[PDB]
Amino acid sequence: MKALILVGGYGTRLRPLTLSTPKPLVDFCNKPILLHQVEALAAAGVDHVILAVSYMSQVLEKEMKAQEQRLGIRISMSHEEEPLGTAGPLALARDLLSETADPFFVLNSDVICDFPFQAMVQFHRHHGQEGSILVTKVEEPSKYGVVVCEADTGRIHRFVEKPQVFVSNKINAGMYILSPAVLQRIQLQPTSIEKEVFPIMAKEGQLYAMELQGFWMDIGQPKDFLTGMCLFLQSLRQKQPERLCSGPGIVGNVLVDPSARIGQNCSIGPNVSLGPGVVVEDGVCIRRCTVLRDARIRSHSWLESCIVGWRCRVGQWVRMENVTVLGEDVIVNDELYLNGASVLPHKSIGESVPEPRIIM
Amino acid sequence: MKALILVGGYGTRLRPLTLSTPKPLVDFCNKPILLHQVEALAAAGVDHVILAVSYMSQVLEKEMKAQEQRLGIRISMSHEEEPLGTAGPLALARDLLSETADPFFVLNSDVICDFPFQAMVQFHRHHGQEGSILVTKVEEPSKYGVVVCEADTGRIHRFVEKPQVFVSNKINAGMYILSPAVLQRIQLQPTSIEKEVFPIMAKEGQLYAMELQGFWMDIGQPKDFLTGMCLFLQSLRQKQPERLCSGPGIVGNVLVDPSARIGQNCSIGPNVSLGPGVVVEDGVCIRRCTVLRDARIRSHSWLESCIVGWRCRVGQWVRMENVTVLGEDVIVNDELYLNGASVLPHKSIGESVPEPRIIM
Ligand SMILES: Nc1nc2c(ncn2[C@@H]2O[C@H](COP(=O)(O)OP(=O)(O)OP(=O)(O)O)[C@@H](O)[C@H]2O)c(=O)[nH]1
Ligand SMILES: Nc1nc2c(ncn2[C@@H]2O[C@H](COP(=O)(O)OP(=O)(O)OP(=O)(O)O)[C@@H](O)[C@H]2O)c(=O)[nH]1
């Protein structure tokens, strides 16, 4: 089959990371998140995948040209000269997806999940109407689309309202299957796929809901990046324990790259993704973190629940907490305390930041 | 001579330490505040000194009758059953200071100086008046009893405890030479030596001032305690340089007891004094701190401008800054941040203290 991934949206949440590297190329547990999605639907059964790019096209082109030989399936690219919103990917590549009269996958690159291509296409061949949505049960995650649905019929009869969610407590999961009739029902005007035109399809009775099995997160925000990282690590523990690194100086679930080395007397705590070539000196407690590629953490430093970017150097006796995110190649001077700091790339922090504050 | 040290009682400023060990007995740079006074009195040529106790005379008097035979001067004691303040024990010891027609030292128990007893008494007999006090220059004279000192002789023109209008700049250094005729003047009823005795003294022209050389501080507060140990280690750098332990990984002036040990890869930063019997683990950075007797600081901690009392166990990856005083036998758990924490005796801390608070 075929698959469309919307991969050019500027990533304005998750900003100190996406100011350098695009949003799906951001390393998510020693892999870009787009590589997770295209590997899942490489092994699933769509043999030709389109991804539509409007933002930093050249390095996405770099790793996509290096990647479609590496998968075996085709990586076609819907390039544009102007951002066409959430739905314009369907309209610019309308000439390529309409050639077959079969439905297709519309994927979103911020989602991390366990993907049901299987149950997606069997459920979509069951329900007989046009549109099919994944939907996940939530408590606070409402920012998404509220869906009012019944039982197994799953025919959506009422739709999206963002706040004060008294009717549903389950929301959208950013992964749909759509037939070609909607694919040429909508303009090439810049518009959203889930605000303007999905409401028409919920009014029309085309829209169905499939409840996802568990482990859903979207990593649009860095807090949600870290929670999705912990969720991905405990769902990686059950399936294959063979990949999680073990040790006396480690705790729980950790994902260290083979390039990355850990110094002795370290207590690498639970839920830590250490990227390629990262260097941890002697006596570093790191919990709930994700250190990305080639970043150095010096000795006697404490790190909890914080994202270290690409090639950042963190000094000695540094304490980082409250989801502090460092951008690309940031230097933290010695004996400082960062609580809440979002540091834009190529900065050299000289004083301790004890409260959440963007440092640019 | 005779020497009268009014030793305070209840030690409310500098409270977490004095809740276990009285203020004359808390070790300031590895020996107690009274011990600096009485070794300088034994070097001064004072024949026997008397200290005017009112609170916790068990441990205090047992220490004085220990070192009475070590200094070689009779460390006599004025017990009180209720506190008489600052001019009451002048009148309780009326007979025990009225026996000789010789002047006597009246010393605050909390001032730490580079005392000039010879200068003070042999400045005193040059004018022979009823009282000759020590004065020092300071930047905020509204906290301390100011004087008006004239040119080349030093008659106290006026004396007010809190000026509030800015009369002048010199202040009470907390050391006096009093003549026995001022003894019988005031009564046993408790009052202040500064409000009434000295302000009627200055009306006559019997109070005098001797300008100090420098390095005056009264250690009432823990902030004044740490500023005073900074200045005392400076005086040791000027005068007796071998007393300070400097080595390879030592930064600045450090005064270590011989019984105290320090691990490798640690940085014992400037103006630090380690008391007796402490044990310092590997990977710490201790700057501007005092660590009192037998306390433990575990690995990879960062301590700055803090007081760690007797038998405390500061855990691993622990940050402490901003005049955080620990009382006797306080256990800090692993990876906690204490900014400003005054911690009551026999407490176990299990949460971070992000703002200056009292923990009880
Ligand atoms: N090619 C392209 N992709 C887009 C465009 N707008 C949104 N997308 C993609 O749509 C997917 C989901 O959109 P969003 O969740 O709103 O993410 P976003 O566009 O990065 O915006 P923010 O979350 O506000 O930072 C993301 O993978 C985006 O890359 C666009 O104009 N062109
Ligand atoms: N013997 C004795 N000396 C006292 C007593 N009260 C005050 N003093 C002395 O009076 C002088 C001024 O007192 P402070 O500077 O306030 O020190 P403190 O008595 O410890 O009291 P705080 O620091 O305010 O809690 C100091 O030298 C004390 O030593 C007392 O009740 N008995």
**Contact (Cβ atoms closer than 8 angstroms) between residue A171 and residue A211:** no
* Positive or negative: CA dihedral A336, A341, A345, A350: negative
- Expressed in angstroms, the distance from the first to the final Cα of chain A is 45
The conformation of residue A154, written as its DSSP 8-state character, comes to -
Q: Which of A158, A192, A218 is the last residue of a domain?
A: A218
Q: Does A317 sit within 8 Å of B337, measured CB to CB?
A: no
Cβ contacts of residue A39 below 8 Å, gap of 6+?
A71
User: Ligand 1 centroid vs A298 CA: distance in angstroms?
Assistant: 36
Give the whole-angstrom CA distance, residue B328 versus residue B342. Answer: 11
Q: Is residue A98 located within the same domain as residue A211?
A: yes
The gap from C-alpha B296 to its chain's centroid, in whole angstroms, comes to 24
Give the whole-angstrom CA distance, residue B284 versus residue B289. Answer: 12
Please list every residue in chain B whose beta carbon sits closer than 8 Å to the beta carbon of residue A315: none
**Contact (Cβ atoms closer than 8 angstroms) between residue B7 and residue B109:** yes
Beta bridge partners of A175: A107
Cα angle, residue B63 at apex, residues B71 and B228 outer, rounded to 5°: 80
**Contact (Cβ atoms closer than 8 angstroms) between residue B16 and residue B26:** no
Kindly give the number of the ligand 1 atom that is closest to the alpha carbon of A78. 1
**Contact (Cβ atoms closer than 8 angstroms) between residue B42 and residue B72:** yes
Q: Is residue A193 located within the same domain as residue A110?
A: yes
Give the whole-angstrom CA distance, residue B214 versus residue B195. Answer: 26
Q: Does B337 sit within 8 Å of A304, measured CB to CB?
A: no
Q: Is residue B14 located within the same domain as residue B112?
A: yes
Beta bridge partners of B48: B2
**Residue owning tokens 């969720």:** A231
**Contact (Cβ atoms closer than 8 angstroms) between residue B159 and residue B201:** yes
Give the whole-angstrom CA distance, residue A8 versus residue A13. Answer: 13
- Report, in angstroms and rounded to the nearest whole number, the Rg of chain A calculated over CA atoms: 21
The gap from C-alpha A94 to its chain's centroid, in whole angstroms, comes to 25
Ramachandran angles phi, psi of B64, nearest 5° = -70, -35
Q: Which domain holds residue A344?
A: 222-358
Residue A288 structure tokens: 């709930």
Query: How many domains does chain B fold into?
Result: 2
Cβ contacts of residue A296 below 8 Å, gap of 6+?
A278, A279, A281, A311, A312, A313, A314
Q: Is residue A136 located within the same domain as residue A181?
A: yes
Please list every residue in chain A whose beta carbon sits closer than 8 Å to the beta carbon of residue B284: 300
| Closest Cβ–Cβ partner in B335, B339, B354 for A302 | B335
Please list every residue in chain A whose beta carbon sits closer than 8 Å to the beta carbon of residue B319: 302, 319, 337
Q: Does B285 sit within 8 Å of A302, measured CB to CB?
A: no
Give the closest residue to B309 by CA, choosing from B289, B333, B337, B280: B289
Please list every residue in chain A whose beta carbon sits closer than 8 Å to the beta carbon of residue B322: none
Burial of B12: CB neighbours in 10 Å, binned 0-12, 13-18, 19+: exposed
Any idea which ligand is nearest the CA of A221?
1
| Determination technique used | cryo-EM
Query: Which one-letter amino acid corresponds to residue B121?
Result: V
Q: Decide: B220 in ligand 2 pocket, CB within 6 A.
A: yes
Q: Which of B191, B218, B245 is the last residue of a domain?
A: B218
**Contact (Cβ atoms closer than 8 angstroms) between residue A6 and residue A109:** yes
Q: Is residue A194 located within the same domain as residue A291?
A: no
The gap from C-alpha B329 to its chain's centroid, in whole angstroms, comes to 22
Side-chain-side CA neighbours of B106 within 13 Å: the count stands at: 25
Q: Could you tell me the CATH number of the domain that includes residue A45?
A: 3.90.550.10
**Contact (Cβ atoms closer than 8 angstroms) between residue A293 and residue A277:** yes
Give the other-Cβ count within 10 Å of B18's Cβ.
21
* Positive or negative: CA dihedral B105, B109, B111, B114: positive
Residue B139, SS3 per DSSP: coil
Q: Could you tell me the CATH number of the domain that includes residue A228?
A: 2.160.10.10
Contacting A with CB below 8 Å, chain B residues are 265, 283-285, 299-300, 302, 304, 316-317, 319, 321, 335, 337, 339, 354
A123-142 in b/e form (b: 16+ CB < 10 A) is bbeebeebbbbbbbebeebb
Helix (H) or strand (E) holding B117: helix B117-127
Give Dmax over CA atoms of chain B in angstroms.
63
Q: Does A300 sit within 8 Å of B285, measured CB to CB?
A: yes
Q: Is residue A279 located within the same domain as residue A338?
A: yes
Q: Is residue B155 located within the same domain as residue B274?
A: no
Angle separating helix axes B57-71 and B33-44, nearest 10 degrees: 30
**Contact (Cβ atoms closer than 8 angstroms) between residue B199 and residue B159:** yes
Q: Which of B4, B5, B7, B10 to mutate to test the pocket of ligand 2 (most atoms within 8 A of CB)?
A: B7
Q: Decide: B86 in ligand 2 pocket, CB within 6 A.
A: yes
The gap from C-alpha B242 to its chain's centroid, in whole angstroms, comes to 24
Give the whole-angstrom CA distance, residue B75 versus residue B64. Answer: 6
Residues with CB under 6 A from ligand 1: A 6-13, 23, 52-54, 83-86, 89, 108-110, 220
**Contact (Cβ atoms closer than 8 angstroms) between residue B104 and residue B3:** yes
**Contact (Cβ atoms closer than 8 angstroms) between residue A86 and residue A4:** no
Task: Establish whether B294 is an annotated binding residue.
Answer: no
**Residue owning tokens 């140990």:** B229
DSSP per residue, B169-214: SEEEEEEEEE-GGGTTTS-SS-B-IIIIIHHHHHHHT-EEEEE--S
Q: Which of B5, B6, B90, B143 to mutate to test the pocket of ligand 2 (most atoms within 8 A of CB)?
A: B6
DSSP per residue, A69-94: HHHSSEEEEEE-SS--TTTHHHHHTH
Give the whole-angstrom CA distance, residue A181 versus residue B310. Answer: 79
Ramachandran angles phi, psi of A185, nearest 5° = -100, -15
Query: Which one-letter amino acid corresponds to residue A323?
Result: V
Give the whole-angstrom CA distance, residue A234 versus residue A271. Answer: 8
Residue set of the binding site of A for GDP-alpha-D-mannose: 110, 218
Q: Is residue B290 located within the same domain as residue B177?
A: no
Cα angle, residue B86 at apex, residues B82 and B88 outer, rounded to 5°: 55
Q: Is residue A169 located within the same domain as residue A303?
A: no
Residue B146, SS3 per DSSP: strand
Q: Which of B218, B243, B262 is the last residue of a domain?
A: B218
Give the whole-angstrom CA distance, residue B210 versus residue B216. Answer: 13
**Residue owning tokens 């973190």:** A289
Q: Is residue B59 located within the same domain as residue B191?
A: yes
Give the whole-angstrom CA distance, residue A351 versus residue A359. Answer: 11
The gap from C-alpha B273 to its chain's centroid, in whole angstroms, comes to 15
Best mutation target, B302, B321, B334, B339, to test chain A (most A CBs within 10 A): B302
Give the other-Cβ count within 10 Å of A300's Cβ.
29
Q: Is residue B294 located within the same domain as residue B327?
A: yes
- Counting every residue written for chain B, the total comes to 360
Please list every residue in chain A whose beta carbon sits closer than 8 Å to the beta carbon of residue B283: 265, 282-283, 299-300
Query: Which one-letter amino acid corresponds to residue B242?
Result: E
Long-range CB contacts (within 8 A, 24+) of B232-236: B232/B28, B232/B29, B232/B112, B233/B29, B233/B271, B233/B273, B234/B271, B235/B114
Give the other-Cβ count within 10 Å of A4's Cβ.
25
Q: Is residue A26 located within the same domain as residue A104?
A: yes
Query: Which one-letter amino acid corresponds to residue A255?
Result: L
- Closest-CA distance, B251 to chain A, in angstroms, reads 15
Residue B67, SS3 per DSSP: helix
DSSP per residue, B279-340: EE-TT-EEES-EE-TT-EE-TT-EEESEEE-TT-EE-TT-EEESSEEE-SS-EE-SS-EEES
- List residues in chain A that are followed by a break over 2.5 Å (C to N): none
Q: Decide: B15 in ligand 2 pocket, CB within 6 A.
A: no
For chain A, what is the total number of helices (H) and then of strands (E)? 9, 27
Protein residue whose Cα sits closest to atom 18 of ligand 2: B8
The conformation of residue B155, written as its DSSP 8-state character, comes to B
Percent helix, percent strand, percent coil in chain A, to nearest 5: 20, 25, 50
**Contact (Cβ atoms closer than 8 angstroms) between residue A206 and residue A156:** no
- Expressed in angstroms, the distance from the first to the final Cα of chain B is 45
- Closest-CA distance, B265 to chain A, in angstroms, reads 10
- Report, in angstroms and rounded to the nearest whole number, the Rg of chain B calculated over CA atoms: 21
Cα angle, residue A312 at apex, residues A308 and A313 outer, rounded to 5°: 115
